[PDB]
A paper describes a structure:
Once secreted by [name], [name] invades eukaryotic cells through an original molecular mechanism that involves a direct translocation of its N‐terminal adenyl cyclase catalytic (AC) domain across the plasma membrane. We have previously shown that a peptide, corresponding to the C‐terminus of the translocation region TR of [name], P454 (residues 454–484), exhibits membrane‐active properties related to antimicrobial peptides (AMPs): this peptide adopts a helical conformation upon membrane interaction and induces a local destabilization of the lipid bilayer. Here, we show that P454 is able to translocate across a lipid bilayer and binds with high affinity to calcium‐loaded calmodulin (holo‐[name]).
Initial attempts to crystallize the P454:[name] complex were unsuccessful. However, we obtained two distinct crystal forms of [name] in complex with a slightly shorter peptide, [name], corresponding to the residues 458–481 of [name] (i.e., shorter than P454 by 4 residues (ASAH) at N‐terminus and 3 residues (MTQ) at C‐terminus), and that displays an affinity for [name] similar to that of P454 (K d [name] = 240 nm). In both cases, several copies of [name] and [name] were present in the asymmetric unit. The superposition of these multiple copies yields an ensemble of [name]:[name] conformations (Supporting Infromation), which illustrates the well‐documented conformational plasticity of [name] due to its central helix flexibility. The structure of the P454:[name] complex presented above reveals several residues of P454 that might be critical for the interaction with [name], including the aromatic residue W458, the arginine residues R461 (R1) and R474 (R2), the aliphatic residues L463, L475, I479 and L481, and finally the histidine residue H477. These results confirm the contribution of these residues in the complex formation as suggested from the observation of the peptide:[name] crystal structure. Substitutions of aliphatic and histidine residues at the C‐terminus of P454 (H477S‐I479A and L475A‐H477S‐I479A) resulted in ≈20‐fold decrease of affinity of P454 for [name], while the mutation of the N‐terminal aromatic and aliphatic residues (W458A‐L463A) results in only a 4‐fold decrease in P454:[name] affinity. These observations are in agreement with the crystal structure of [name]:[name], showing that the residue H477, and more importantly I479, from the C‐terminal part of P454 are crucial for P454:[name] interactions.
Author numbering:
A (entry chain A): 3 to 148
B (entry chain B): 458 to 481
The structure:
């Protein structure tokens, strides 16, 4: 399942954070890399970043902790992209709003024999701003609901 | 130029993409 070339990418990414080589990524190193790429965070934001993955509670990120951090960012971006792709499927015109017609068309294309009242309901239940259309934000809110 | 090293360049690009994904 896992390949040596994969482990090599993992290791190199870790060292690009752990520039000193002590085996741990501190908030200082973590901050500096974000800094060198534009975006500027605060040490509170940094500490929250370390905190989400600090399994041992030692205030730093060791290798397996960086592996988890990595897997979570990947999964987060995979879901965020599946949602963007679905939205672009429904918003047939690219105007950023899903109309009742667009939902009607896509659904019968997918095979779903929905009545007009069924698509007006889908639209109404995801419409927050109440404009009769579903924008991207409302689309995401529905897609990731519990 | 030697696929044991030019492969290394490919892995450098891979690690860089990973560090961008964590910064973002
Ligand atoms: Ca370090
Ligand atoms: Ca959190
Ligand atoms: Ca730790
Ligand atoms: Ca539309
Ligand atoms: Ca709306």
């Amino acid at each position: 399942q896992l390949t040596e070339e994969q482990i090599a990418e993992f290791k190199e990414a870790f060292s690009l954070f752990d520039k000193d080589g002590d085996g741990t990524i501190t908030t200082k190193e973590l901050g500096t890399v974000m800094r060198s790429l534009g975006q500027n965070p605060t040490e509170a934001e940094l500490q929250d970043m370390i905190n989400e993955v600090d399994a041992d509670g030692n205030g730093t990120i060791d290798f397996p902790e960086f592996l988890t951090m990595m897997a979570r960012k990947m999964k987060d971006t995979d879901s965020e992209e599946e949602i963007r792709e679905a939205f672009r499927v429904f918003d047939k015109d690219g105007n950023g709003y899903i109309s009742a017609a667009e939902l009607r068309h896509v659904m019968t294309n997918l095979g779903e024999k929905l009545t007009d009242e069924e698509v007006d309901e889908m639209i109404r239940e995801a419409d927050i701003d109440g404009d009769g259309q579903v924008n991207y934000e409302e689309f995401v809110q529905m897609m990731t609901a519990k | 130029w030697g696929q044991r090293a030019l492969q290394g360049a490919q892995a450098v690009a891979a690690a860089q993409r990973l560090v961008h994904a964590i910064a973002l």
